[PDB]
Write a protein that holds these residues in place. Structure first.
Motif, PDB file in Angstrom:
ATOM      1  N   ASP A 284       0.747  -1.362  -0.090  1.00 15.80           N
ATOM      2  CA  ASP A 284       0.119  -0.001  -0.067  1.00 15.80           C
ATOM      3  C   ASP A 284       0.838   1.084   0.047  1.00 15.80           C
ATOM      4  O   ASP A 284       1.985   1.222   0.511  1.00 15.80           O
ATOM      5  CB  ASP A 284      -0.999   0.156   1.306  1.00 15.80           C
ATOM      6  CG  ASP A 284      -1.803  -1.011   1.016  1.00 15.80           C
ATOM      7  OD1 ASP A 284      -2.220  -1.690   0.296  1.00 15.80           O
ATOM      8  OD2 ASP A 284      -2.486  -1.290   2.407  1.00 15.80           O
TER       9      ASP A 284
ATOM     10  N   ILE B 226       6.503  -1.566   2.056  1.00 17.49           N
ATOM     11  CA  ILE B 226       6.914  -2.819   1.617  1.00 17.49           C
ATOM     12  C   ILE B 226       7.510  -3.902   2.945  1.00 17.49           C
ATOM     13  O   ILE B 226       8.010  -3.178   3.789  1.00 17.49           O
ATOM     14  CB  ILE B 226       7.513  -2.783   0.332  1.00 17.49           C
ATOM     15  CG1 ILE B 226       9.292  -2.223   0.807  1.00 17.49           C
ATOM     16  CG2 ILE B 226       7.220  -2.074  -0.702  1.00 17.49           C
ATOM     17  CD1 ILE B 226      10.238  -2.772  -0.164  1.00 17.49           C
ATOM     18  N   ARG B 227       7.546  -4.768   2.558  1.00 19.66           N
ATOM     19  CA  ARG B 227       8.199  -5.750   3.382  1.00 19.66           C
ATOM     20  C   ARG B 227       9.243  -6.671   2.838  1.00 19.66           C
ATOM     21  O   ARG B 227       8.718  -7.465   1.625  1.00 19.66           O
ATOM     22  CB  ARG B 227       7.253  -6.545   4.387  1.00 19.66           C
ATOM     23  CG  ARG B 227       6.321  -5.470   5.322  1.00 19.66           C
ATOM     24  CD  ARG B 227       5.546  -6.339   6.324  1.00 19.66           C
ATOM     25  NE  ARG B 227       6.246  -7.293   7.100  1.00 19.66           N
ATOM     26  CZ  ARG B 227       5.901  -8.088   8.149  1.00 19.66           C
ATOM     27  NH1 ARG B 227       4.651  -7.823   8.278  1.00 19.66           N
ATOM     28  NH2 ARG B 227       6.745  -8.729   8.622  1.00 19.66           N
ATOM     29  N   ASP B 228      10.330  -7.084   3.253  1.00 19.42           N
ATOM     30  CA  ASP B 228      11.124  -8.272   2.651  1.00 19.42           C
ATOM     31  C   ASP B 228      12.122  -8.857   3.596  1.00 19.42           C
ATOM     32  O   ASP B 228      12.450  -8.102   4.442  1.00 19.42           O
ATOM     33  CB  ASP B 228      12.312  -7.446   1.479  1.00 19.42           C
ATOM     34  CG  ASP B 228      13.038  -8.426   0.838  1.00 19.42           C
ATOM     35  OD1 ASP B 228      12.322  -9.389  -0.132  1.00 19.42           O
ATOM     36  OD2 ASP B 228      14.208  -8.657   1.012  1.00 19.42           O
ATOM     37  N   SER B 229      11.933 -10.180   3.640  1.00 16.46           N
ATOM     38  CA  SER B 229      12.549 -10.892   4.614  1.00 16.46           C
ATOM     39  C   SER B 229      12.339 -10.494   5.992  1.00 16.46           C
ATOM     40  O   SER B 229      13.289 -10.526   6.797  1.00 16.46           O
ATOM     41  CB  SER B 229      14.384 -10.870   4.267  1.00 16.46           C
ATOM     42  OG  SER B 229      14.657 -11.409   2.922  1.00 16.46           O
ATOM     43  N   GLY B 230      11.210 -10.338   6.502  1.00 13.78           N
ATOM     44  CA  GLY B 230      10.786  -9.840   7.610  1.00 13.78           C
ATOM     45  C   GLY B 230      10.901  -8.252   7.876  1.00 13.78           C
ATOM     46  O   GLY B 230      10.606  -8.003   9.133  1.00 13.78           O
TER      47      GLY B 230
ATOM     48  N   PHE C  83      10.068  -1.496   4.916  1.00 16.81           N
ATOM     49  CA  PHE C  83      10.851  -0.307   4.353  1.00 16.81           C
ATOM     50  C   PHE C  83       9.942   0.543   3.658  1.00 16.81           C
ATOM     51  O   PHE C  83       8.511   0.322   3.406  1.00 16.81           O
ATOM     52  CB  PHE C  83      11.707  -0.792   3.254  1.00 16.81           C
ATOM     53  CG  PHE C  83      12.846  -1.777   3.856  1.00 16.81           C
ATOM     54  CD1 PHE C  83      12.617  -3.204   3.770  1.00 16.81           C
ATOM     55  CD2 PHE C  83      14.214  -1.484   3.980  1.00 16.81           C
ATOM     56  CE1 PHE C  83      13.354  -3.956   4.269  1.00 16.81           C
ATOM     57  CE2 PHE C  83      15.085  -2.286   4.404  1.00 16.81           C
ATOM     58  CZ  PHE C  83      14.744  -3.727   4.520  1.00 16.81           C
TER      59      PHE C  83
ATOM     60  N   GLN D  38       9.307   2.374   0.626  1.00 17.37           N
ATOM     61  CA  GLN D  38       9.906   2.536  -0.964  1.00 17.37           C
ATOM     62  C   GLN D  38       9.727   3.580  -1.770  1.00 17.37           C
ATOM     63  O   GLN D  38       8.347   3.654  -2.044  1.00 17.37           O
ATOM     64  CB  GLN D  38       9.652   1.176  -1.534  1.00 17.37           C
ATOM     65  CG  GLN D  38      10.128   1.055  -2.910  1.00 17.37           C
ATOM     66  CD  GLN D  38       9.315   0.276  -3.791  1.00 17.37           C
ATOM     67  OE1 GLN D  38       9.102  -1.079  -3.525  1.00 17.37           O
ATOM     68  NE2 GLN D  38       8.957   0.639  -4.771  1.00 17.37           N
TER      69      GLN D  38
ATOM     70  N   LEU E  77      10.539 -17.629   6.949  1.00 15.26           N
ATOM     71  CA  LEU E  77      10.961 -16.794   8.032  1.00 15.26           C
ATOM     72  C   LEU E  77      10.227 -17.042   9.308  1.00 15.26           C
ATOM     73  O   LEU E  77       9.082 -17.673   9.621  1.00 15.26           O
ATOM     74  CB  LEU E  77      11.145 -15.396   7.833  1.00 15.26           C
ATOM     75  CG  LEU E  77      11.955 -15.058   6.744  1.00 15.26           C
ATOM     76  CD1 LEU E  77      12.436 -13.763   6.538  1.00 15.26           C
ATOM     77  CD2 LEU E  77      13.633 -15.865   6.724  1.00 15.26           C
TER      78      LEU E  77
ATOM     79  N   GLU F 147       6.048 -15.838   6.972  1.00 19.52           N
ATOM     80  CA  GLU F 147       6.379 -15.112   5.764  1.00 19.52           C
ATOM     81  C   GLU F 147       7.411 -15.836   5.004  1.00 19.52           C
ATOM     82  O   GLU F 147       8.321 -16.457   5.437  1.00 19.52           O
ATOM     83  CB  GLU F 147       6.514 -13.686   6.048  1.00 19.52           C
ATOM     84  CG  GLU F 147       7.354 -13.108   6.666  1.00 19.52           C
ATOM     85  CD  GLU F 147       7.329 -11.841   7.493  1.00 19.52           C
ATOM     86  OE1 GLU F 147       7.089 -10.790   6.684  1.00 19.52           O
ATOM     87  OE2 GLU F 147       7.575 -11.704   8.725  1.00 19.52           O
TER      88      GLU F 147
END
Lengths: 101, 101, 101, 101
Positions: free
Chosen positions: A43, A60-64, A67, A69, D49, D53
């Motif tokens: 979102d 956003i979310r990456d590997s927990g 961030f 963006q 993870l 997720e």
């Protein structure tokens, strides 16, 4: 849109996507922010950073990790941890009426 | 906006302005076209060409001639001569709600 | 895919979209070309230019004119007129098996 | 590919390599994940993870430790420690057919 929603004007080019990419929010567009709507990964939102400054980015979310963006590849991603807070979800965007006269 | 006005989706990069320019209508945006509102020089519009196809451009005048000018400098301007008709003035533009999840 | 379809390997960065944009076809990917399938505006295709060289681009149309558009904003659009011909529609794209071992 | 293998859509720019690098998996691509194929260093994979997720990264080893490395240098590498499990090896990748109209 809740009674808490409010409009803001996009400032700067950090959310302007490269030609051919979408979505894109050029400087000058208006965005509707709703504090009462949760912001999920993917979102668009308004976030409050360390110096309490507002920023318009994609959450956003990456590997927990979360961030903030920017859609403009030339701008840096921003880690969204303890010092960062989500103000509201961006739920609408349009050019002001004056744009067309 | 008259009752004849209708929304249309922008297709292509011809009306995507260079980063920093105002305004810009990237692929994916929606534009409100009003057939009942006159299109003056400098206004944005929809035009019908000889191939029953349409084009979204800015209407301008030069050397006593009408031209349809793209906001993206890489696309060519076209003479709005005989075989080209104005469909309506663009009076609003916004991202579809699906853009925000 | 017809009996005329054939695979090609993407060469160069002209079809590599900016980070965050899609689709994107980086150098090294494979694309399936089918001569027996018509190419409509918006489709990806292989076109034959003046020097009879093959090029992989997106076929688009604006204001009645056809162009071969690269997904990489740094590359130029190419007018697709008399000297240009469509070889086939790109109908599939994947990384070669070896990519994963 | 075993019968347990399944397709998944790539989300985000974490596995989008810098222009010119090989390979690259931009947002929108599909990847085939095989839970029944071991993931060796240098292989691409899906990992689970602590937050239930998942993440799509390249598996690498360093200082006697396992790490999940993104192809996009702007995203951080994560230690694949205790609370992180390998879901399967990525063995194929392609654009969905809808990509080509």
């Amino acid at each position: 849109a809740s009674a808490s929603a409010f409009w803001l004007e996009v400032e700067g080019n950090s959310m302007t996507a490269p030609t051919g990419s979408k979505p894109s929010f050029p400087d000058g567009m208006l965005i509707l922010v709703d504090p009462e709507q949760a912001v999920e990964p993917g979102d668009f939102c308004i976030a409050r950073l360390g110096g309490d400054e507002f920023t318009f980015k994609k959450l956003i979310r990456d590997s927990g990790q979360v961030f903030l963006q920017p859609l403009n590849p030339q701008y840096p991603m921003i880690p969204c941890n303890e010092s960062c807070s989500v103000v509201g979800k961006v739920i609408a965007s349009q050019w002001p009426e004056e744009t067309f006269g």
